[PDB]
A and B are shown apart, each in its own frame.
Chain A
Amino acid sequence: VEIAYHKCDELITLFNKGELETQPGCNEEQTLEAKIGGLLSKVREEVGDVCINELDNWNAPLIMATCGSKGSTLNVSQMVAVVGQQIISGNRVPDGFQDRSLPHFPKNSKTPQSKGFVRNSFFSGLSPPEFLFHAISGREGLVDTA
């Protein structure tokens, strides 16, 4: 998780003060937005990959998610190892305030964990601004079906 942070921090410091090759994703700031979305994605799945692999036999959630009962390997992975990238609307947590997610974060919010990202599982608990982000996606998906 930490090795996936400063790498993006190295990419985000080149955002305003530097130049980089842009995909045909149109304009700037969308370029790294697709990159930060791609990087943190793989890292998430990768952390949860080794989790279930080394998990002990005869456990209930594995066997239950194994055959017919309930849920999938993706669900139990969020319980134990790590969650990540809460995303509504097709993008990342649009700013409520001016150029910032929450007042608890510095101006011009860019770096991961400042927007729609949580490195904590359901077991370990949730940091205070790891919560509201999850409340968003929960509210969004709930009103959707309704």
Chain B
Amino acid sequence: MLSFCPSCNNMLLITSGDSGVYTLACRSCPYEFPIEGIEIYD
């Protein structure tokens, strides 16, 4: 989906949250996301 984190600005990968929730966080640095993710390519 090619997203990025403020500050460090590397990449955002989807990680499985415990018990039912699906989240995403930047690797090696603390962060979390509200989801509602979307992408479209033609």
Task: Please tell me whether chains A and B touch each other in their complex, using a CB distance cut-off of 8 A.
Answer: no
